């Protein structure tokens, strides 16, 4: 199947009471493999997946150096944005950055991304053409002009299409036992008699990896897309995920409904029906 | 592996 490598960065100003907080995390698909936290005693980029541990001292030194440089760029950015928005210096603000690349089943480049947000809102993003920018508002037009003048899109395009895809492949191969593994969901259905004449049928998918999964309910043979209760996929805490889909049905008619589960770990899609 | 050259906003 397809894969992705993504880095996430969070920068939060803590005016008066400390330097800004800087947290960086890296992921290959739904597996976190590295982390950096400016508040930790270490001051080192740290391993979070088993396979990255085969990287040597040079790798760790280089990544630790690049993540500190990112922290400094963000440290400056906080003040720059505060100025653009004529904001007070007593308040706490947040800058977020995310970048990465996706490859297909054949490990060939599919797409790149580089997005930036201020106070939980889009600020500036690199378009899919990896050449131009989408600036959310007016202050972002200022950053956009500086990024065009400095040719930031060309700088990013070189990394995203090259370095990013090369290392993603190296990691997929080095951590194949787990990264290229596929934990098929364990499914079951529960029944809860909610009120007279009705009952809730809840379809479960547990202990699955990767996180992508499609749970659907049909009545007779028709999709019940608009009438299905679907919870956000959640982590189990052991590297796998959980999710459920529920439908409200009339009592005595639960066997007209079928839950369908689609996942990469399953040879073919599963159909569940209440006993 | 992280991006090396990064530009201020």
């Amino acid at each position, epitope marked *: 199947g397809s894969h992705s490598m993504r880095y996430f960065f969070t920068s939060v100003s803590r005016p008066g009471r400390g*330097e800004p907080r800087f947290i960086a995390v890296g992921y290959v698909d739904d597996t976190q493999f590295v982390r950096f936290d400016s508040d930790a005693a270490s001051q080192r980029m740290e391993p979070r997946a088993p396979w990255i541990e085969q990287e040597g001292p040079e790798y760790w030194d*280089g990544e630790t150096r690049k993540v*500190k*440089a990112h922290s*400094q760029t963000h440290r400056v950015d906080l003040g720059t944005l505060r100025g653009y928005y004529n904001q007070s210096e007593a308040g706490s603000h947040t800058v977020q950055r995310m970048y990465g690349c996706d490859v297909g089943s054949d490990w060939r480049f599919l797409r790149g991304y580089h997005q930036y947000a201020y106070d939980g809102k889009d600020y500036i993003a690199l378009k899919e053409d990896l050449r131009s920018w989408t600036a959310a508002d007016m202050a972002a037009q200022t950053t956009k002009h500086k990024w065009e003048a400095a040719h930031v899109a060309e700088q990013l395009r*070189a990394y995203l299409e090259g370095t990013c895809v090369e290392w993603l492949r190296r990691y997929l191969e080095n951590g194949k036992e787990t990264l290229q593994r596929t934990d098929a969901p364990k499914t079951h259905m529960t029944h809860h008699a909610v009120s007279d004449h009705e009952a809730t049928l809840r379809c479960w998918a547990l202990s699955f990896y990767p996180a992508e999964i499609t749970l659907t309910w049909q009545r007779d043979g028709e999709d019940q897309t608009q009438d299905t209760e679907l919870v956000e996929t959640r982590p189990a805490g052991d590297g796998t995920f959980q999710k459920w889909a529920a439908v409200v049905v009339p009592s005595g008619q639960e066997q007209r409904y079928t839950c369908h589960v689609q996942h990469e770990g399953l040879p073919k899609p599963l159909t569940l029906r209440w006993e | 592996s992280l991006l*090396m*050259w990064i*530009t201020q906003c």
Partner: T-cell receptor
Amino acid sequence: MKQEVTQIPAALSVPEGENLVLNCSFTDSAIYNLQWFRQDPGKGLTSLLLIPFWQREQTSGRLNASLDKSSGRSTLYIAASQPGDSATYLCAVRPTSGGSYIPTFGRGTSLIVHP
Amino acid sequence: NAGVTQTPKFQVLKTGQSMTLQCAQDMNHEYMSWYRQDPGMGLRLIHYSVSVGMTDQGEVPNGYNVSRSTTEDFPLRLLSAAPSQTSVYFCASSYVGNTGELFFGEGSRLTVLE
């Protein structure tokens, strides 16, 4: 590829009024930028031109430089040389991996423009 | 604006004396470095930094100490000057992005004598 920057010839001596060329070669093409400087004995370094990996050339008055990143070389051209151009010209490159951002400098080319 | 500002420009020291060379920049540069250049010789990196709280060694770190508690400053400290440290020192800074253009301070000439 451990980066190594070379500048040959190491010394150059020309009569004023002549256009001239200084050479810079580097072993690893994976550079972020190349920058040309100038330094007189007992003095500091003055930046002349800076060529990012996305540009092919730059111009500043009577000076212009080209960058052939793929073949690992850059050429600084000086038009109608004047005795004031006399100095040691230095070429430096920055890397694209490692997180050190440390520049690699060439030894330099000593230029003497005779009046 | 002011560019890179180094001080002092000239200095004489007796062996064993302490000395701090100041290097300031008002361009919000992330990268700052210190070089020593002996007369007629090449530029040799002593120490560098890419962030507040971060310092790393160059080619000749021995005998020198650096610190980066602020974005603007990168002071070079000589704990106990030796005659071998007589040289011309340059501080250089740049962004860790944009065009990556390097900016040199005007230089500091230090002479250490017995």
